[PDB]
Design a protein around this nucleic acid. Structure first.
Ligand SMILES: Nc1ncnc2c1ncn2[C@@H]1O[C@H](COP(=O)(O)OP(=O)(O)OP(=O)(O)O)[C@@H](O)[C@H]1O
Ligand SMILES: Nc1ncnc2c1ncn2[C@@H]1O[C@H](COP(=O)(O)OP(=O)(O)OP(=O)(O)O)[C@@H](O)[C@H]1O
Ligand SMILES: [Zn+2]
Ligand SMILES: [Zn+2]
Lengths: 464, 465
RNA sequence: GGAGUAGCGCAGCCCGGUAGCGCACCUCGUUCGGGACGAGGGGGGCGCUGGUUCAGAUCCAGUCUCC
């Protein structure tokens, strides 16, 4: 057996690594998947981090209904309940594709004065956006995510919120997933329908395609107006609130897999990996007892350092087999504990990134955290390298067509949907975002030639 | 203040306290609710506790699909059905999961091959839909959050041990965290889970006398294994079906918390699951608003340092007496009253939602609270116990029975026949709560039909939620 | 033009005989420092619907499905 190399067929690589690492499996219903323990463990760590962040910024979790009145909101990407309770529903119900509406409805009745603001809500849950074609974590009918919703008195506080969150998403990606990203602004064609504008963080997968890791929307008074959400300000004036919306789904897991995965399988970032150190004991019948005891002692010492450790006791498998399994599963470090090692009060530390090294057993606990960090740092620097190595400034549409086969294309655009739409029908590439810290440039649209829009180059790429 | 007293109309008391304490609100769709922050905070603490307990017992969370193939369930009333999706009409209509046994079975069928593949120790935190067009927050709603565990074993014994391991967890959650007393027992054939061999449960008594099923744990034998073809080759070369179990606890547990300890002043939350354990209320006047608030702010840090979940109520817009009532309504166990005066004397007033009032040095507080919170929990539980005892009654005649099922628990003898049981329910509207595990050995005659007593002990009866 | 046969990958159909092989899985022993070895085993009735036949993955007719 093996594993289709990325260069041969990335899509297959992806699908197989997901299956073999037991991250997920396919559900009986088309477009639906089953997230197995190891994969779900990753999602939990993401929840934990984001949740802490959201909390430190005054948000509070709540839980709104799965079912939304159709009238609020048959659209294609919508699953509809029509039968329920045996009889046929008066009005057909939609399975939430997002929660803005229902929350708006409730906000309408909860918000009265400026004392009811700001509204800082977050909800962890599932949503359904129909798709009969499957692709684990990247595009599925049902999927888990976190969707935040806030309501403000002023348009300024709202926008500061929109940014605050995108930065959180970015911190999650950079300091925890070691996934580099571009903080930017979607174009009119690419933004959220009901939003005024949409901010996003874009990542580059090892296959060159781009991925939207998370979005943060400024909704202005669209929903306030649509759902009548007003309040009496301090100046005794009854005005409309300004709402924002932000969300990150398990697609972020897909990003992790496609940003660091190699031909041996997964490579999970230390800060989010279910298992950080996997201990693989190595023995013969006469060594087993004493060797396993050491392993368990080591397991304790590591658990104490607050590390996430796993001891692979499975006796039905050989050391070499295990070495592979865990490399497949992306565990950052492996500790090989054999009789020779045990004899010399040492052990071997093999890094998923590459290399083995011998160290004494007692030193191991204190030394792993730092090594784990160094591990993180490396992963990130390599991803960075990869990104730069695949981002390119295109001036001639011919250069553009070439660069969007490799990765990011930094071109100019007229800011015309019609043109944008054409570039996609042609090269399939799309607008990823108008980067915020992007250098100021003025030129002419790469495909139609009309004066450059956005006063800076737009990030283009074939995306997921 | 207009909180309908429990004795006047419990149902209204319940509904209003939920509204006023901002635990939840009604959603636009019939039977659906919205869990507001404060209420959801409670659910989160429950998750936290249960999950640590599930984890220490080797379970692992996973996430299975919301949509289940109708054929798997073979439209049954309690189901919500998707028929339209993607614009076109579905080939086969999809059911919104009312529970996950089936889909997990399907998956288990393909994952399990060897005994080395068992046990399967799975748990899933999520939502499920069981249609109901009539609403009652946390007690009975169309959609609701819960935790549903599923395990697969090689032997029936390991499976049954799992079934009791979990019910005990549920019971520990109720007793050591919710301070809600409960009876660990076994449902009767009429009252068990359809697909289960047998059903274990924990039963609680609400302040209105009605009973509530806080959590269940089922032994499914080989029903699903067989239904979904879940076999494996054992150490003995023999191929066989696995033995699966199932257990679940929903946010109905919140309803239990509300109805077990709630009083006419409103909620009374058990300290171990309360989102706010201590509320600081600074009392002052402009010429002291600076020093009081300074101390209050300081005490806040001192308390957070202790890991205590505290909330400071600065709200200058409101009067002390107003805040006092709000926090008694929302159930906060303790209140610290920090006044202009007592700060120079260095003392403060600690007031417990249970009638305690004491003065203590601000310095002693941080350290003293933890133990007090414990003493609190104990008392909550003590009272609930007392209530239940005062509302449980051994009956030997069907007249006494009818009387006792108006007050609470009725400990009657039964024949063991579903027919009689369904009769007792048609007449008295009472049902079987459970056949207690630790009940005292007793033989007698069915409280209604006269025939010799089954179970070898008294069955717990009651009007239930 | 091919192909739907065990979880996965395949052969068997021409010249009908009651289903086979690799991987995986179960047993036992030997192994164990980079995916072990031997022997012994378990699991499907061949996409679906007809038909011919003593007998049908195999022959005939037809239908569905992926390239
Ligand atoms: N089908 C899907 N499967 C998984 N995650 C998704 C899916 N669609 C969107 N997401 C995630 O949900 C987040 C918020 O949803 P949003 O509506 O902003 O995205 P979207 O426009 O649906 O994205 P795309 O169309 O690129 O999938 C996205 O940033 C992404 O992480
Ligand atoms: N409609 C509901 N709303 C909230 N929680 C519920 C609801 N139905 C059941 N639960 C919770 O889910 C747990 C497991 O559900 P299960 O299918 O065993 O219940 P059930 O037999 O339908 O309940 P009951 O006996 O109360 O009708 C119950 O112990 C309870 O805590
Ligand atoms: Zn153009
Ligand atoms: Zn009887």
């Amino acid at each position: 057996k093996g594993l289709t190399p990325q260069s041969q067929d990335f899509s297959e690589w992806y699908l197989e690594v997901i299956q073999k690492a037991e991250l997920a499996d396919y559900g009986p219903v088309r477009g639906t998947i089953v997230v197995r323990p190891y994969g779900y463990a990753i999602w939990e760590n993401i929840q934990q981090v984001l949740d802490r962040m959201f909390k430190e910024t005054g948000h509070q979790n709540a839980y709104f209904p799965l079912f939304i009145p159709m009238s609020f909101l048959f659209s294609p990407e919508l699953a509809v309940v029509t039968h329920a309770g045996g009889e046929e529903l008066e009005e057909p119900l939609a399975v939430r594709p997002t929660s803005e509406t229902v929350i708006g409805y409730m906000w309408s009745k909860w918000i009265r004065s400026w004392r009811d603001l700001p509204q800082l809500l977050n909800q962890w849950g599932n949503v359904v956006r129909w798709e009969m074609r499957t692709r684990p974590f990247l595009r599925t009918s049902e999927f888990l995510w976190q969707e935040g919703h806030t309501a403000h008195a002023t348009r300024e506080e709202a926008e500061e919120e929109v940014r605050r969150m995108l930065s959180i998403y970015a911190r999650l990606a950079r300091e925890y997933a070691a996934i580099p990203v571009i903080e930017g602004l979607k174009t009119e064609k690419e933004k959220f329908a009901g939003a005024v504008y949409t901010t996003t963080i874009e990542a580059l997968m090892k296959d060159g395609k781009a991925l939207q890791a998370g979005t943060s929307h400024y909704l202005g008074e669209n929903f306030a107006r649509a759902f009548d959400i007003k309040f009496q300000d301090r100046d005794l004036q009854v005005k409309y609130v300004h709402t924002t919306s932000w969300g990150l789904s398990w697609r972020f897991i897909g990003a992790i897999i496609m940003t660091h995965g190699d031909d041996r399988g997964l490579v999970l970032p230390p800060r989010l990996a279910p298992i950080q150190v996997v201990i693989v004991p190595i023995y013969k019948d006469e060594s087993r007892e004493r060797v396993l005891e050491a392993a368990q002692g080591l397991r304790q010492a590591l658990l104490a350092q607050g590390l996430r450790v796993h001891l692979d006791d499975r006796d039905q498998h050989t050391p070499g087999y295990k070495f592979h399994e865990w490399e497949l599963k992306g565990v950052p470090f492996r500790v090989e504990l054999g009789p020779k090692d045990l004899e010399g009060g040492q052990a071997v530390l093999a890094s998923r990134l590459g290399g083995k090294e011998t160290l004494p057993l007692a030193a191991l606990p204190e030394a792993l955290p730092g090594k784990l960090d160094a591990f993180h740092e490396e992963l990130y620097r390599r991803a960075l390298a990869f990104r730069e190595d695949h981002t390119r400034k295109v001036d001639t549409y011919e250069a553009f067509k070439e660069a969007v086969q490799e990765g990011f294309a930094l071109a100019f655009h007229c800011g015309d949907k019609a043109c944008e739409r054409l570039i996609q029908e042609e090269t399939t590439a799309t607008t990823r975002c108008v980067p915020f810290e992007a250098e100021p440039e003025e030129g002419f649209c790469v495909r139609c030639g009309r004066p450059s829009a956005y006063g800076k180059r737009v990030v283009f790429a074939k995306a997921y």
